[PDB]
Amino acid sequence: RTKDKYRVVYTDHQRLELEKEFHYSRYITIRRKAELAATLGLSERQVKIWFQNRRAKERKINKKKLQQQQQQ
DNA sequence: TTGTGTTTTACGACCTCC
DNA sequence: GGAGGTCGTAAAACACAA
Numbered sequence: 001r002t003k004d005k006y007r008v009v010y011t012d013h014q015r016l017e018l019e020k021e022f023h024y025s026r027y028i029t030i031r032r033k034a035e036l037a038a039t040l041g042l043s044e045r046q047v048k049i050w051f052q053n054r055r056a057k058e059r060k061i062n063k064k065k066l067q068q069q070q071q072q
Numbered sequence: 073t074t075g076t077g078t079t080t081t082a083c084g085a086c087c088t089c090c
Numbered sequence: 091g092g093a094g095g096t097c098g099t100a101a102a103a104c105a106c107a108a
Contacts, residue, residue: 008081048093
């Protein structure tokens, strides 16, 4: 959810907050999630998923770094 | 423009956890 | 008694050289 829009761009504000809390801890907790969702106007499920996407982004960034250590 | 390669939301299938 | 982890991918959104 939702899905009358295939997917929705989160605001610069919303992404800033999520990137900051991600630096604080890579796995959000049930309470933190509940709080962030409410302060940011997104659902628990959207935070949940965002966190899942961001750790995949990190894994993808990390493999690239590793490939660059390997070539250098 | 465009067209093509990358990044950002959302999900399904499947797995792990006493 | 279910939450939340990954992997892989669709589609929309964006970046950018040609």
